[PDB]
Amino acid sequence: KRQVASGRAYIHASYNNTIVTITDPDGNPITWSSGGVIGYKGSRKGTPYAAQLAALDAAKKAMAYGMQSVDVIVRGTGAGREQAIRALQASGLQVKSIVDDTPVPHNGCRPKKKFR
Amino acid sequence: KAKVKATLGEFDLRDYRNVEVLKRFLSETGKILPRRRTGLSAKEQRILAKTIKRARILGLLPFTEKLVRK
Amino acid sequence: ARRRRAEVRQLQPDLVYGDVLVTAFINKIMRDGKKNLAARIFYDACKIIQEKTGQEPLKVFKQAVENVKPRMEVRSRRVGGANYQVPMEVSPRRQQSLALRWLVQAANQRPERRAAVRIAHELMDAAEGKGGAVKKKEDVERMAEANRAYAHYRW
RNA sequence: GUGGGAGAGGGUGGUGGAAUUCCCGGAGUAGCGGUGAAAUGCGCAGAUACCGGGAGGAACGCCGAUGGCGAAGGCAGCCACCUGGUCCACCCGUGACGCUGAGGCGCGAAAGCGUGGGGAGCAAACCGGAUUAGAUACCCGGGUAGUCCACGCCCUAAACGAUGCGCGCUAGGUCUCUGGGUCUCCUGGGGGCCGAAGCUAACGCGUUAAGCGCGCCGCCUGGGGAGUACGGCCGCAAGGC
Ligand SMILES: [Mg+2]
Ligand SMILES: [Mg+2]
Ligand SMILES: [Mg+2]
Ligand SMILES: [Mg+2]
Ligand SMILES: [Mg+2]
Ligand SMILES: [Mg+2]
Ligand SMILES: [Mg+2]
Ligand SMILES: [Mg+2]
Ligand SMILES: [Mg+2]
Ligand SMILES: [Mg+2]
Ligand SMILES: [Mg+2]
Ligand SMILES: [Mg+2]
Ligand SMILES: [Mg+2]
Ligand SMILES: [Mg+2]
Ligand SMILES: [Mg+2]
Ligand SMILES: [Mg+2]
Ligand SMILES: [Mg+2]
Ligand SMILES: [Mg+2]
Ligand SMILES: [Mg+2]
Ligand SMILES: [Mg+2]
Ligand SMILES: [Mg+2]
Ligand SMILES: [Mg+2]
Ligand SMILES: [Mg+2]
Ligand SMILES: [Mg+2]
Ligand SMILES: [Mg+2]
Ligand SMILES: [Mg+2]
Ligand SMILES: [Mg+2]
Ligand SMILES: [Mg+2]
Ligand SMILES: [Mg+2]
Ligand SMILES: [Mg+2]
Ligand SMILES: [Mg+2]
Ligand SMILES: [Mg+2]
Ligand SMILES: [Mg+2]
Ligand SMILES: [Mg+2]
Ligand SMILES: [Mg+2]
Numbered sequence: 001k002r003q004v005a006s007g008r009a010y011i012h013a014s015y016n017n018t019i020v021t022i023t024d025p026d027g028n029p030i031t032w033s034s035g036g037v038i039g040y041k042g043s044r045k046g047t048p049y050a051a052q053l054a055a056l057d058a059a060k061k062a063m064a065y066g067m068q069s070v071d072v073i074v075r076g077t078g079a080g081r082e083q084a085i086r087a088l089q090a091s092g093l094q095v096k097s098i099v100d101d102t103p104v105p106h107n108g109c110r111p112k113k114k115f116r
Numbered sequence: 117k118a119k120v121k122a123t124l125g126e127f128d129l130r131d132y133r134n135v136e137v138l139k140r141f142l143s144e145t146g147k148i149l150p151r152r153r154t155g156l157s158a159k160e161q162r163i164l165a166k167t168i169k170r171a172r173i174l175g176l177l178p179f180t181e182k183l184v185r186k
Numbered sequence: 187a188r189r190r191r192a193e194v195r196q197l198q199p200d201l202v203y204g205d206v207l208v209t210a211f212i213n214k215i216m217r218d219g220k221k222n223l224a225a226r227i228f229y230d231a232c233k234i235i236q237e238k239t240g241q242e243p244l245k246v247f248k249q250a251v252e253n254v255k256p257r258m259e260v261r262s263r264r265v266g267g268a269n270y271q272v273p274m275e276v277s278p279r280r281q282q283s284l285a286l287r288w289l290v291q292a293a294n295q296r297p298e299r300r301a302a303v304r305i306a307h308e309l310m311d312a313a314e315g316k317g318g319a320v321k322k323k324e325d326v327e328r329m330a331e332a333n334r335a336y337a338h339y340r341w
Numbered sequence: 342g343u344g345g346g347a348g349a350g351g352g353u354g355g356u357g358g359a360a361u362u363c364c365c366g367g368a369g370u371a372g373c374g375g376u377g378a379a380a381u382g383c384g385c386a387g388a389u390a391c392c393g394g395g396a397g398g399a400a401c402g403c404c405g406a407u408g409g410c411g412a413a414g415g416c417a418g419c420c421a422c423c424u425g426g427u428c429c430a431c432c433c434g435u436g437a438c439g440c441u442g443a444g445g446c447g448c449g450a451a452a453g454c455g456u457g458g459g460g461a462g463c464a465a466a467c468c469g470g471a472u473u474a475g476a477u478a479c480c481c482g483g484g485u486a487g488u489c490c491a492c493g494c495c496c497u498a499a500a501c502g503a504u505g506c507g508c509g510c511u512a513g514g515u516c517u518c519u520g521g522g523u524c525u526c527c528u529g530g531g532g533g534c535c536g537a538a539g540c541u542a543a544c545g546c547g548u549u550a551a552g553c554g555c556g557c558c559g560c561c562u563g564g565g566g567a568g569u570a571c572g573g574c575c576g577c578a579a580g581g582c
Contacts, residue, residue: 008391010390012389012390012391016373016374016376017373017375019389020390021369021390022391023368023369023390023391023392024368024391026392026393027393028391028392029368029370029390029391030369031369031370032369032389032390032391034372036371036372036373036374037370037371037372042376042378043375043376043377043378044335047336047338048337049334049336049338050335073391074186079338097184098184098185099182099183099186100182100183103359104359104402105359105360105361105400105401106358106359106401106402106403106418107360107400107402108359108361108400109361109362109400109461109462110361110400110463110488111462111463112462112463112464113463113464141404142403143403147402147403147404148403148404149404150403150406151405158406158408158409158517158518158519159347159518159519161404161405162347162348162404162409164404165403165404165405166404166419168403168404169404169418169419170420173358173418173419173420179358180358266378267377267378268377268378
């Protein structure tokens with residue numbers, strides 16, 4: 001009910017999960033998916049196969065919205081952070097460009113004990 | 117690979133306003149290039165870093181950028 | 187095989203067909219070292235399988251063994267705690283061995299009274315695409331495509 | 342003295358972007374988070390993810406080094422101001438004015454104390470979830486003091502180069518920071534690495550001495566008892582000498 005025909009795709013990948021949000025050219029989201037949206041529940045959500053399935057499910061929902069041309073934004077690191085982009089390439093969506101926009105601070109905040 | 121100073125003129129390392137030549141010393145991202153790729157001496161690099169930061173605060177050089185093709 | 191490649195034994199050809207897979211299957215039928223009785227089993231089964239269906243037992247044997255050969259399987263790999271079932275492909279030699287073993291084990295798990303009858307009907311069913319050996323093969327393949335989520339643990 | 346130089350040396354005020362958190366709004370469904378697995382937890386009062394706006398605190402990515410500065414503790418965005426130390430060249434001035442230094446005095450990471458502010462993130466104590474034979478721990482989710490600032494205390498440390506300060510003498514080679522020079526190089530002054538002689542119980546040190554000497558200060562005399570007791574002094578206390 002939107003007929004967007006083009007937009008962005010953000011891939012947020014961590015070591016616990018990978019989620020994909022397909023949005024429109026001025027930033028508002030259209031659809032999304034993740035390792036928990038699909039069947040997987042626990043650490044299974046962080047596997048590259050779950051990332052592939054999440055990307056494919058989000059891409060098919062975007063097809064339902066009528067998406068053809070997609071620009072890719074990537075933030076984070078984890079298993080399947082690349083597999084998401086591979087499935088997104090071979091999903092039937094013409095990939096416009098891939099961009100890694102992983103937010104990194106200029107050393108402002110103190111991390112948790114795990115990250116030091 | 118070519119180092120920045122190798123392909124460049126007799127330019128001012130203290131001019132924070134010349135974006136044309138200061139852009140050469142930034143990476144694909146907004147990061148300042150190491151001495152391995154700038155071919156500068158320690159003193160030259162130390163001056164270039166401060167001039168780059170000055171240009172950044174004047175909105176002439178990017179504080180950070182986005183990586184492509186990743 | 188810590189040092190060497192463990193060169194494969196080259197079986198003798200067969201006296202009836204001249205084919206090596208027949209000798210391999212006859213060895214897989216043999217027990218307690220009776221290759222004579224096993225050969226008689228296989229060849230009476232050959233007569234029965236050539237008569238009950240008017241086809242050459244050669245190509246039916248070949249097509250059955252080809253139908254039973256699987257293309258993927260699972261092996262256990264120890265990673266981060268308890269091991270996981272990781273799928274992977276199969277060697278051609280191992281495909282041959284597994285196919286013949288499943289053939290014999292599904293033939294002797296059959297109801298038929300005589301051994302040769304079991305062998306013949308098992309080969310028939312396997313050549314048609316059904317039977318117990320092909321069921322075990324397709325269960326092996328069903329292990330794949332199922333735990334495929336571990337496709338990054340190939341090793 | 343003159344003339345040049347490098348620097349996260351210190352103090353004060355300003356100021357920039359990234360990120361976290363929170364709030365407002367838009368769009369958008371069903372989970373997010375987390376782990377070896379999990380669960381507590383958060384989510385239909387609309388989360389997570391995405392976009393725009395706002396608020397606030399703390400710390401300064403790339404440059405960055407095996408680098409620099411400082412007496413030590415220690416000191417990293419940028420700008421301005423106030424200010425310390427130091428190096429080199431000129432061979433100009435004074436004319437032994439030097440070295441060390443018991444006591445004294447000042448400085449002194451972090452944590453801790455007092456009064457008043459501040460509070461994002463982190464986080465002793467604490468509250469829960471797991472794990473385990475038990476879990477008072479490691480792992481996960483929260484969370485106060487604190488961490489931050491002003492002022493006044495506290496005087497400890499693996500406060501380490503486990504190497505007191507100063508001066509002279511004793512092969513070189515290699516990398517480096519910073520000056521000067523007639524600039525394959527030389528000559529100072531710092532930071533490393535090999536290694537002459539020599540030293541050392543050995544490891545190792547070796548013009549940055551743990552070598553050869555001189556001056557002065559501090560300290561040592563088997564281990565446990567014990568940095569305890571008593572006494573004194575200091576401290577609001579903790580406690581310190
Ligand atoms: Mg997870
Ligand atoms: Mg400074
Ligand atoms: Mg300062
Ligand atoms: Mg909202
Ligand atoms: Mg709820
Ligand atoms: Mg609930
Ligand atoms: Mg607030
Ligand atoms: Mg660094
Ligand atoms: Mg020094
Ligand atoms: Mg000065
Ligand atoms: Mg004179
Ligand atoms: Mg005179
Ligand atoms: Mg003195
Ligand atoms: Mg004294
Ligand atoms: Mg102190
Ligand atoms: Mg403190
Ligand atoms: Mg306080
Ligand atoms: Mg926390
Ligand atoms: Mg905690
Ligand atoms: Mg318990
Ligand atoms: Mg001495
Ligand atoms: Mg020079
Ligand atoms: Mg030197
Ligand atoms: Mg040297
Ligand atoms: Mg010697
Ligand atoms: Mg040495
Ligand atoms: Mg000496
Ligand atoms: Mg000695
Ligand atoms: Mg003593
Ligand atoms: Mg004693
Ligand atoms: Mg004590
Ligand atoms: Mg006494
Ligand atoms: Mg006392
Ligand atoms: Mg008292
Ligand atoms: Mg004590």
